[PDB]
Amino acid sequence: ATSQPINFQVQKDGSSEKSHMDDYMQHPGKVIKQNNKYYFQTVLNNASFWKEYKFYNANNQELATTVVNDNKKADTRTINVAVEPGYKSLTTKVHIVVPQINYNHRYTTHLEFEKAIPTLA
């Protein structure tokens, strides 16, 4: 596999304002290529809060996600999101539930990469 870091920012639906969700993913992320498949690998923090997450490309196709590291002690989850070179953003739809703080909401957010997913190797 070949990999490199990638900067990204989660923005509110319909605005350039940073979404609160930006704080709940680790920065930077990573692009990895293995056997002709590319992934955006990202770490969800406070993983227990994330009841659902779905990622879509700019053609509104849902992208496969795979959990690769579930760190229960740290309450983080590392996932690989299937991408292709040239993707500039992902629509990221979440359902966040935190019963202890009376919180249960769905959000659509716009995850903007600093540059398009690169070709690697």
CATH number for 48: 2.60.40.1850
Q: Which of 101, 45, 115, 52 has its CA nearest to residue 74?
A: 45
* Omega prior to 118 cis, within 30 of 0: no
Annotated binding site: 12, 19, 103
Count of domains in the chain? 1
The Cα–Cα gap between 46 and 39 comes to: 22
In terms of residue numbers, what domain contains 18? 1-121
**Do residues 26 and 112 make contact, with C-beta atoms less than 8 angstroms apart?**
no
Annotated binding site for heme: 12, 19, 103
> Obtained via which technique?
X-ray
For 32-71, b/e burial (b = at least 16 CB within 10 A) is bbeeeebbbbbbbeebebbeebebbbeeeeebebeeeeee
Looking at the DSSP bridge assignments, the partners of residue 95 are 52, 106
